[PDB]
């Protein structure tokens, strides 16, 4: 896998963000995670978290996996990095997202994320409290 550049357009919620990628606006959905919707428990906290992380970054990167790059809604599917830190992993580590939507071929960082979830659970963080 390799990192490519992108720039923030707008924070949307815990696991979606609008970025400019190869000069075009698109909504990215984060691979391998599920945050609660804004209207659910911890939804506002997950939104705040992603928002701070992407709005504070000097450098946003996108990393596609080996399979599907867009979903059926035309959302990009990627791992997203903020100054070299993976948003997907960080949400899970804090108990603000669950590992989810694991499909064959788009799962390079599965084990990394499950390891983070185990540690958030152990600490009873947020969703796990
Ligand atoms: C994360 C991810 C979601 N999706 C689709 C499956 C779900 O279909 P349905 O809309 O039919 O439930 C939807 C969940 O995204 P959200 O959690 O953003 O709603 O997005 C993929 O197809 N591939 C993926 O890698
Ligand atoms: Ca969601």
């Amino acid at each position: 896998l390799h990192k490519e550049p992108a720039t923030l357009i707008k924070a949307i919620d815990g696991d979606t963000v609008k970025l400019m990628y190869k000069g075009q606006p698109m909504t990215f959905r984060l691979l391998l995670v599920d945050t609660p919707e804004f209207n659910e428990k911890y939804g506002p906290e997950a939104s705040a978290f992603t928002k701070k992380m992407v709005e504070n970054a000097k450098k946003i990167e996108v990393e596609f996996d080996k399979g599907q790059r867009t979903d059926k809604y035309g959302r990009g599917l990627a791992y997203i990095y903020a100054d070299g830190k993976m948003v997907n992993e960080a949400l899970v580590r804090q108990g603000l997202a669950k590992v989810a939507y694991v499909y064959k071929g788009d799962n390079t960082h599965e084990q990394l994320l499950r390891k983070a979830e185990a540690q958030a659970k152990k600490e009873k963080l947020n969703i796990w409290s």
Side-chain angles (χ1 to χ4, degrees), residues 106-117:
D106 264 7
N107 69 343
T108 303
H109 297 312
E110 184 174 15
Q111 221 164 351
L112 186 74
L113 276 36
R114 288 193 180 288
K115 175 64 166 283
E117 191 182 81

PDB file of all heavy atoms in Angstrom, residues 106-117:
ATOM      1  N   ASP A 106      -9.875  -5.910   0.948  1.00  0.00           N
ATOM      2  CA  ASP A 106      -9.706  -4.555   1.550  1.00  0.00           C
ATOM      3  C   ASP A 106      -9.481  -4.661   3.089  1.00  0.00           C
ATOM      4  O   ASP A 106     -10.211  -4.056   3.850  1.00  0.00           O
ATOM      5  CB  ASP A 106     -10.970  -3.671   1.294  1.00  0.00           C
ATOM      6  CG  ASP A 106     -10.858  -2.762   0.081  1.00  0.00           C
ATOM      7  OD1 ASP A 106      -9.871  -2.858  -0.681  1.00  0.00           O
ATOM      8  OD2 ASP A 106     -11.834  -1.969  -0.133  1.00  0.00           O
ATOM      9  N   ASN A 107      -8.481  -5.432   3.533  1.00  0.00           N
ATOM     10  CA  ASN A 107      -8.242  -5.700   4.945  1.00  0.00           C
ATOM     11  C   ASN A 107      -6.783  -5.749   5.403  1.00  0.00           C
ATOM     12  O   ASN A 107      -6.501  -6.389   6.398  1.00  0.00           O
ATOM     13  CB  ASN A 107      -8.927  -6.990   5.334  1.00  0.00           C
ATOM     14  CG  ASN A 107      -8.245  -8.206   4.688  1.00  0.00           C
ATOM     15  OD1 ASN A 107      -7.466  -8.060   3.706  1.00  0.00           O
ATOM     16  ND2 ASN A 107      -8.451  -9.385   5.282  1.00  0.00           N
ATOM     17  N   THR A 108      -5.864  -5.099   4.690  1.00  0.00           N
ATOM     18  CA  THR A 108      -4.429  -5.036   5.076  1.00  0.00           C
ATOM     19  C   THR A 108      -4.189  -4.673   6.579  1.00  0.00           C
ATOM     20  O   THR A 108      -3.486  -5.345   7.296  1.00  0.00           O
ATOM     21  CB  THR A 108      -3.647  -4.106   4.131  1.00  0.00           C
ATOM     22  OG1 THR A 108      -3.798  -4.571   2.769  1.00  0.00           O
ATOM     23  CG2 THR A 108      -2.188  -4.153   4.456  1.00  0.00           C
ATOM     24  N   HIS A 109      -4.860  -3.669   7.075  1.00  0.00           N
ATOM     25  CA  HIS A 109      -4.639  -3.211   8.473  1.00  0.00           C
ATOM     26  C   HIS A 109      -5.628  -3.782   9.481  1.00  0.00           C
ATOM     27  O   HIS A 109      -5.700  -3.285  10.591  1.00  0.00           O
ATOM     28  CB  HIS A 109      -4.689  -1.715   8.521  1.00  0.00           C
ATOM     29  CG  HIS A 109      -3.602  -1.061   7.727  1.00  0.00           C
ATOM     30  ND1 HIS A 109      -2.276  -1.433   7.815  1.00  0.00           N
ATOM     31  CD2 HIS A 109      -3.636  -0.017   6.881  1.00  0.00           C
ATOM     32  CE1 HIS A 109      -1.550  -0.682   7.008  1.00  0.00           C
ATOM     33  NE2 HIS A 109      -2.353   0.191   6.423  1.00  0.00           N
ATOM     34  N   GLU A 110      -6.331  -4.866   9.128  1.00  0.00           N
ATOM     35  CA  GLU A 110      -7.229  -5.548  10.106  1.00  0.00           C
ATOM     36  C   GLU A 110      -6.594  -5.861  11.460  1.00  0.00           C
ATOM     37  O   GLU A 110      -7.164  -5.591  12.552  1.00  0.00           O
ATOM     38  CB  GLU A 110      -7.825  -6.867   9.545  1.00  0.00           C
ATOM     39  CG  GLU A 110      -8.834  -7.495  10.553  1.00  0.00           C
ATOM     40  CD  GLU A 110      -9.595  -8.722  10.058  1.00  0.00           C
ATOM     41  OE1 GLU A 110      -9.205  -9.330   9.038  1.00  0.00           O
ATOM     42  OE2 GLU A 110     -10.538  -9.135  10.777  1.00  0.00           O
ATOM     43  N   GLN A 111      -5.493  -6.591  11.414  1.00  0.00           N
ATOM     44  CA  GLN A 111      -4.938  -7.051  12.678  1.00  0.00           C
ATOM     45  C   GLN A 111      -4.523  -5.875  13.599  1.00  0.00           C
ATOM     46  O   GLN A 111      -4.713  -5.942  14.813  1.00  0.00           O
ATOM     47  CB  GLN A 111      -3.710  -7.901  12.392  1.00  0.00           C
ATOM     48  CG  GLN A 111      -3.656  -9.102  13.266  1.00  0.00           C
ATOM     49  CD  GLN A 111      -2.684 -10.149  12.752  1.00  0.00           C
ATOM     50  OE1 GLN A 111      -2.145 -10.064  11.610  1.00  0.00           O
ATOM     51  NE2 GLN A 111      -2.459 -11.169  13.587  1.00  0.00           N
ATOM     52  N   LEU A 112      -3.893  -4.870  12.993  1.00  0.00           N
ATOM     53  CA  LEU A 112      -3.538  -3.605  13.684  1.00  0.00           C
ATOM     54  C   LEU A 112      -4.740  -2.992  14.386  1.00  0.00           C
ATOM     55  O   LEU A 112      -4.683  -2.571  15.543  1.00  0.00           O
ATOM     56  CB  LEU A 112      -3.027  -2.595  12.676  1.00  0.00           C
ATOM     57  CG  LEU A 112      -2.476  -1.283  13.233  1.00  0.00           C
ATOM     58  CD1 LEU A 112      -1.122  -1.579  13.851  1.00  0.00           C
ATOM     59  CD2 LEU A 112      -2.424  -0.257  12.122  1.00  0.00           C
ATOM     60  N   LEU A 113      -5.853  -2.904  13.659  1.00  0.00           N
ATOM     61  CA  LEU A 113      -7.054  -2.324  14.267  1.00  0.00           C
ATOM     62  C   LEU A 113      -7.639  -3.230  15.350  1.00  0.00           C
ATOM     63  O   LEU A 113      -8.153  -2.744  16.317  1.00  0.00           O
ATOM     64  CB  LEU A 113      -8.147  -1.987  13.227  1.00  0.00           C
ATOM     65  CG  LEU A 113      -8.034  -0.625  12.506  1.00  0.00           C
ATOM     66  CD1 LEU A 113      -6.629  -0.205  12.217  1.00  0.00           C
ATOM     67  CD2 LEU A 113      -8.811  -0.566  11.200  1.00  0.00           C
ATOM     68  N   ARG A 114      -7.645  -4.537  15.162  1.00  0.00           N
ATOM     69  CA  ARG A 114      -8.230  -5.386  16.217  1.00  0.00           C
ATOM     70  C   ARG A 114      -7.398  -5.267  17.518  1.00  0.00           C
ATOM     71  O   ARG A 114      -7.900  -5.356  18.648  1.00  0.00           O
ATOM     72  CB  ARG A 114      -8.363  -6.835  15.716  1.00  0.00           C
ATOM     73  CG  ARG A 114      -9.474  -6.977  14.677  1.00  0.00           C
ATOM     74  CD  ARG A 114      -9.853  -8.396  14.382  1.00  0.00           C
ATOM     75  NE  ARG A 114     -10.926  -8.452  13.367  1.00  0.00           N
ATOM     76  CZ  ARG A 114     -12.205  -8.119  13.559  1.00  0.00           C
ATOM     77  NH1 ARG A 114     -12.682  -7.680  14.734  1.00  0.00           N
ATOM     78  NH2 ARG A 114     -13.046  -8.272  12.570  1.00  0.00           N
ATOM     79  N   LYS A 115      -6.099  -5.098  17.339  1.00  0.00           N
ATOM     80  CA  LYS A 115      -5.186  -5.002  18.475  1.00  0.00           C
ATOM     81  C   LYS A 115      -5.550  -3.737  19.286  1.00  0.00           C
ATOM     82  O   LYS A 115      -5.731  -3.788  20.506  1.00  0.00           O
ATOM     83  CB  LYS A 115      -3.729  -5.020  17.983  1.00  0.00           C
ATOM     84  CG  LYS A 115      -2.646  -4.804  19.031  1.00  0.00           C
ATOM     85  CD  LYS A 115      -2.645  -5.928  20.060  1.00  0.00           C
ATOM     86  CE  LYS A 115      -1.378  -5.938  20.927  1.00  0.00           C
ATOM     87  NZ  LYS A 115      -0.159  -6.487  20.274  1.00  0.00           N
ATOM     88  N   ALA A 116      -5.750  -2.633  18.590  1.00  0.00           N
ATOM     89  CA  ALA A 116      -6.250  -1.385  19.190  1.00  0.00           C
ATOM     90  C   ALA A 116      -7.622  -1.510  19.892  1.00  0.00           C
ATOM     91  O   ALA A 116      -7.847  -0.981  20.978  1.00  0.00           O
ATOM     92  CB  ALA A 116      -6.328  -0.334  18.124  1.00  0.00           C
ATOM     93  N   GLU A 117      -8.548  -2.225  19.259  1.00  0.00           N
ATOM     94  CA  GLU A 117      -9.851  -2.466  19.890  1.00  0.00           C
ATOM     95  C   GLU A 117      -9.710  -3.269  21.215  1.00  0.00           C
ATOM     96  O   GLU A 117     -10.398  -3.025  22.210  1.00  0.00           O
ATOM     97  CB  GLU A 117     -10.779  -3.166  18.891  1.00  0.00           C
ATOM     98  CG  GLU A 117     -12.228  -3.209  19.365  1.00  0.00           C
ATOM     99  CD  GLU A 117     -13.164  -3.952  18.416  1.00  0.00           C
ATOM    100  OE1 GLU A 117     -13.179  -5.165  18.480  1.00  0.00           O
ATOM    101  OE2 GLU A 117     -13.841  -3.332  17.590  1.00  0.00           O
TER     102      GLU A 117
END
